[PDB]
Amino acid sequence: RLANFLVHSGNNFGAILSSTNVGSNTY
Amino acid sequence: RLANFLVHSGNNFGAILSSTNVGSNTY
Amino acid sequence: RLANFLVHSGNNFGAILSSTNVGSNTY
Amino acid sequence: RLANFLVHSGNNFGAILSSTNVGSNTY
Amino acid sequence: RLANFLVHSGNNFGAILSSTNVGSNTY
Amino acid sequence: RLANFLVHSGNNFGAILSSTNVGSNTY
Amino acid sequence: RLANFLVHSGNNFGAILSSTNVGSNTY
Amino acid sequence: RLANFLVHSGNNFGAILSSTNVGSNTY
Amino acid sequence: RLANFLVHSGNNFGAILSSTNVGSNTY
Amino acid sequence: RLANFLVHSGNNFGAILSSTNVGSNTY
Amino acid sequence: ANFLVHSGNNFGAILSSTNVGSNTY
Amino acid sequence: ANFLVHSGNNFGAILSSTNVGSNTY
Amino acid sequence: ANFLVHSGNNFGAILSSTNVGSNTY
Amino acid sequence: ANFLVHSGNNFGAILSSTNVGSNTY
Amino acid sequence: ANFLVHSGNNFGAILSSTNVGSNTY
């Protein structure tokens, strides 16, 4: 019985320019 | 019994320019 | 018995320009 | 019985330029 | 019974330029 | 008056999400 | 008056998330 | 008046998250 | 008046997170 | 008036986090 | 005499803004 | 005489801003 | 006489700003 | 006579700023 | 006569600033 939690809650990102893998969940 | 949770809740992104894989869930 | 959850709830995106894979779920 | 928690709550990012793997969860 | 917690709460990042692995959880 | 309630009394093995926008300018 | 309540009394093995925006300018 | 309550009385083995924005300019 | 309460009375084996922004300019 | 309370009376084996921003300019 | 010239300006996306790319007098 | 020239300016994204890329007099 | 010239300026992202890339007189 | 020249300036990201990349007189 | 020249300036990120990369007179 294995449980994996990847959560994003109430996060604010002002500006994202020429970036990669920002605010993402990767399994 | 395996459970995987990838959640995005209440996230705000002001501006995203020329970016990749922003605010995404990848399994 | 395997359950996978990829959820997007209440997310706001102001502007998305020339970007790829933004706010998406990929399995 | 194994449980893994990767959480992001109430984080603010002013500006992200030409960066990689910012504010992300990787399993 | 093993539990691993990787948490980010109330963190503020003013500006992130040409950086890698900032404010991220890696398992 | 605004009253927003999320009540849980049973056994939950899945995802329960609630998103609310009251009198807001959301982009 | 604003009243936001999250009440949990049962057994939870999953994710319970709540997001609220009241009178805000969200981008 | 603003009242934000998170109440937990049962057995929790998962994630319980709450995010609130009241009268804010969020980017 | 602002009242923010987090109350816990049961047995918690997981994550309980609360994030609040009241009358703020968040970037 | 601002009242921020975190009350714990039960048995906690996990993480309990609280983040609050009241009338602030956060970047 | 007052001369105002506006040319060749590219605007990506404008949200809830005022007096953008205009000749205001 | 007053001369104002605006040319070849690229703007990515503008949010809740005032007097951006404008000839204000 | 007053001469104001604006050319070849690249702006990435502008949020809650005033008088950006403008010829203000 | 007053001459103001602005050219070839790259701005990455601007947040809650005033009089950025402008010819203010 | 007054001459102000601005060229080839790279700005990474600007937050809550005033009179940045500008020709103020």
Author numbering:
A (entry chain G), B (entry chain D), C (entry chain A), D (entry chain J), E (entry chain M), F (entry chain C), ...: 11 to 37
K (entry chain B), L (entry chain E), M (entry chain H), N (entry chain K), O (entry chain N): 13 to 37
Paper quotes:
Human islet amyloid polypeptide (IAPP) is a 37-residue polypeptide hormone that is co-secreted with insulin from pancreatic β cells and plays an essential role in glycemic regulation. IAPP forms amyloid deposits in the pancreas of >90% of individuals with T2D.43–45 A single genetic mutation resulting in a serine to glycine substitution at residue 20 (IAPP-S20G) is associated with familial, early-onset T2D.46,47 Recently, cryo-EM structures of IAPP amyloid fibrils assembled in vitro for the wild-type (WT)48–50 sequence and IAPP-S20G48 have been determined, as well as those of patient-seeded WT IAPP. Here, we used cryo-EM to determine structures of amyloid fibrils at different times during in vitro fibrillation of a disease-related variant of human islet amyloid polypeptide (IAPP-S20G). Strikingly, the fibrils formed in the lag, growth, and plateau phases have different structures, with new forms appearing and others disappearing as fibrillation proceeds.
The fibrils present after 6 weeks, which represents the growth phase of fibril formation, are strikingly different to those observed at the 3-week time point. More surprisingly, and in marked contrast to the single structure solvable to high resolution at 3 weeks, six distinct fibril polymorphs could be identified at this time point. However, four fibril structures could be solved to high resolution (3.1–3.4 Å). The IAPP-S20G fibril polymorphs share a conserved two-protofilament (2PF) core, with one polymorph containing an additional peptide chain to make a 3PF fibril in which the additional chain has a different fold to those in the 2PF core. However, they share the ability to accrete new subunits to form additional protofilaments that lead to the generation of higher order fibril assemblies. This principle was suggested in our earlier work that first revealed the structures of 2PF and 3PF S20G-IAPP fibrils, but that study lacked the temporal (and spatial) resolution of the present study. Here, we describe structures that show that subunit accretion is a generic property of in vitro IAPP-S20G fibril assembly. Accretion of different subunits then builds larger fibril assemblies by different packing of these five subunit folds.
